[PDB]
Symmetry: D3
């Protein structure tokens, strides 16, 4: 067995959702969950079939995003992993409810717009995702000014009243 | 600390759901969640108590399946992990909702019928599940003909109209 | 890349919930989810901002609980990880529903009162949580007397009728 | 405006789920939710399109059940109401989660195997479901022997341990 | 058929949750859901069995509250209705998630601390809950000072930051 | 007591969600749930406070939509009812998950883009919503050609593959 670190290649600030699913119906169900959750949502979805034909499956509403999802899943090469790439202006908070609720979804490793690397283990014709390096290590702790800043930020973004 | 690879023993046609929980009530709650979700469901369930007597706990509607869940948990030897072995014809899409919603369940590592191996870390009398190798690596990417084939499959199975 | 084992410090009787989220709104949303779930709940919450100023963000009801959450999270030093430390008498089964449903929450690594150690991977200015050592390995399998004990236990605690 | 009482007819041992939804996608979504929840489930589903051509829509896995669902819905004649008739051995507790979570479902009026009558208000070419007469009025309050009886029943059925 | 207006008897300091369920397991499941949601919760639960012996079923952690729940159900006399009376300091927001998710629960008519009256329709030995008069009619529309106050109130109570 | 029929004012290109909630936190919680669910969502929200100041509370991202929601609630005058008016292009299927999950939300009466009327009961200074006339009665049942039509429609719309 060997460990590897695989960076996810994507434009800066682009949001992705990396998870684990099962059953071929994962593709149609997640595509449907996403378009039902947000009108006009632009995304790309890829799912790594882990048996039978063992083909990476894809679906989406934006070819640029579908390409990113597929190419990255080919690099990861992990059975049953899925990757959703969201277009600009679309966020994981808008759709995580639908991903979590999908009957084929088992778990979600990460949802983020930060640079990310995936820790994987490999043995024979199998690979496992061990974790995700999401963004960077902390540089300190917020002071009163920073506490006021994040509270105020959410109000200006329209997320808090 | 040492890293180990533990294969999960199970008949190829059976599905297993491996996860993390806490509190002894995990056993009765999951058993109840399963029988409430699917009528006549056959399964075996085991939970690894991580303190006190530190005993593997089990419950089920099929003795052979219960034994299989317990045997695998003894090999995994990870505190607070649980394993459900579903009988033939019962699938994770039928019950993941109930497992996800169980108050004691923290997360699910895998739900699958594919060959499964678990990466674990060990230190002293403690073990951690780091990830799972679920099925195999991708052999390629589907083309439109294959997309048509998987759509056809779901309609023939009655999952899509 | 290097693997490390990080122990969690806290009184024996306190429960902690360790997970992965994203977006700064994680703090207010989780704080609100907790106080909405249980009246008079006491806790400390910390979230590791993984971009920008990269500051650990915190919120809570008692200074001692907040210190525990922040102190441990700083030791873990993993982007987008969050840690909730529950005060005496408040349990994960009481609030996991609200944590799982939080739109910023991606997954939960562990919920426990047992001694806990976290397996992490580090590369440059990034770290990833690979897994958790929750409590200890199993010493055996429950027999009939122990099955009876755990069933009776739940009735005496008032969790089962 | 006038009030009417509409009986819902079905085989004594079968369960019906009567609710309110919207959007034509209600039919395929509920059919899929049902077959995904329970393997081999037999049911009949009907939905009353409230605008456009105003046609009762239907789908299912059993002709007799689909016919029953449509006939009952035609008698109800209420825009956006849906009715599911479950085959023998399939219960609302097995599928309510999926009906509740369906994006088109607004609410559920009843889920029962009891004699059922629906109170409706009518005005012009519009009708509203005001409530349901589900079974009969109480004849008294259980004493402890009856408590013991209902507890024993659930243990005999395998719903409680 | 006749319409009746039935006032709910409840101390001004208590909250109630009135809903519709089915199957005898409603009693143990809802009691379990409440005690799992909030530690030390005080409540009374009653459920109107609508077939068989047709007995009001009861369970709870406070005898006075259980009796009040039963008294109200005897007055309402509606098949399959359930009533939870919450003790002082325990609120519906703390437990509605568990009530909504209970597999036997079909819907919830009301959750409130306000004076409540139930509109019912009666025909033979059957009754239907048509709606609830929850509190009083509006006296106007909030101005900016009132918006500011309702926001400040939630911050002083600790529900918002 | 008297029954009344109250029409809901709603331009044809808009959708509404009418429901029942409780507690003043309903306003901020629902507004937050909506903006977290869909980016840039345009809506108006009104809530009929049924205690204390008894004011129709208002919040939203579009002044005209907010005013429409408020106007309708002044006409309905039912304690604890809430109304969300969605701007053109935003649909109930996009947000019902968030409304259902809101801790203050008890139930949803209707979600629709069709003409709506509300049946209400009035006694003293209280009113109860008894039901909703959502759209119209059925004109018939779909035949095979119409089934084919509704299936085709969803594929053209991109909701089904």
């Amino acid at each position: 067995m060997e460990l590897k670190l695989i960076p996810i290649e994507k434009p800066e600030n682009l949001n992705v959702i990396l998870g684990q699913a099962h059953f071929i119906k994962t593709v149609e169900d997640l595509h449907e969950a996403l378009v039902t959750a947000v009108p006009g949502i632009r995304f790309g979805l890829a799912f790594s079939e882990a048996s039978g034909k063992r083909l990476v499956r894809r679906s989406g509403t934006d070819e640029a995003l579908v390409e990113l999802a597929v190419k990255n899943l080919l690099n990861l090469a992990c059975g049953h992993v899925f990757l959703i790439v969201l277009g600009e202006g679309f966020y994981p908070i808008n759709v995580l409810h639908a991903v979590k609720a999908c009957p084929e979804v088992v778990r979600i490793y990460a949802a983020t717009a930060n640079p990310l690397k995936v820790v994987v283990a490999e043995e024979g014709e199998q690979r496992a995702i061990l974790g995700v390096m999401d963004g960077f290590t902390p540089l300190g702790v917020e002071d009163e000014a920073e506490v006021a800043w994040r509270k105020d930020l959410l109000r200006r973004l329209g997320y808090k009243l």
